[PDB]
Amino acid sequence: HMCDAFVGTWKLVSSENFDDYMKEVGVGFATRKVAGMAKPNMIISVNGDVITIKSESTFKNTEISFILGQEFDEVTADDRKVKSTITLDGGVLVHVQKWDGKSTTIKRKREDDKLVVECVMKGVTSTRVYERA
């Protein structure tokens, strides 16, 4: 019952600073535009120790599966090849991506009836709020 409050199908309801976050990450113009237009559903499931997170939109359908604390290689929606580790820290799922000497952290937390995603790259934070579908 690790992560139960995260499990489910979630729909994006608001975004702030995502274009600026993607700029800082290095996402190019055309991908930023089409990805910033995405209205993703985030689908989170658990089977034993394996957590799966899917992001589905008209831009891309992506899926990762992982065990907490155990690094994996990921291809991101914007085609970076990154090394990822996801942990649960005080109720927050913390996802760190490392590539080309850079790092970004994506945090997922439950707040009221929302799932709030905070994406940080150097000084820039984007907040992406989801509700149950």
Ligand X SMILES: [C][C][C][C][C][C]SC1=NC([O])=N([C]C2=[C]N=[C][C]=[C]2)C([S])=N1
Tell me if 84 contacts ligand X by CB under 6 A: no
Q: Is the Cβ of residue 46 or residue 78 nearer to ligand X in the bound state?
A: 78
Tell me if 22 contacts ligand X by CB under 6 A: yes
Please, which residues bridge with residue 26 across strands? none
Report how many residues bind ligand X under the rule CB under 6 A: 17
Helix, strand or coil for residue 17? coil
Element (H, E) at 30: helix 29-37
- Is 129 a known ligand-binding residue? yes
Helix, strand or coil for residue 79? coil
Tell me if 99 contacts ligand X by CB under 6 A: no
- Is 108 a known ligand-binding residue? no
Minimum CB separation from ligand X for residue 25, in Å? 6
Asked if 18 contacts 10 with a C-beta cutoff of 8 angstroms, the reply is no
Structure-token pair, residue 39: 């209205």
Tell me if 57 contacts ligand X by CB under 6 A: yes
Asked if 118 contacts 125 with a C-beta cutoff of 8 angstroms, the reply is yes
Chain contacts with ligand X (rule: CB under 6 A): 22, 25, 27, 35, 38, 40, 55, 57, 59-60, 76-78, 106, 117, 119, 128
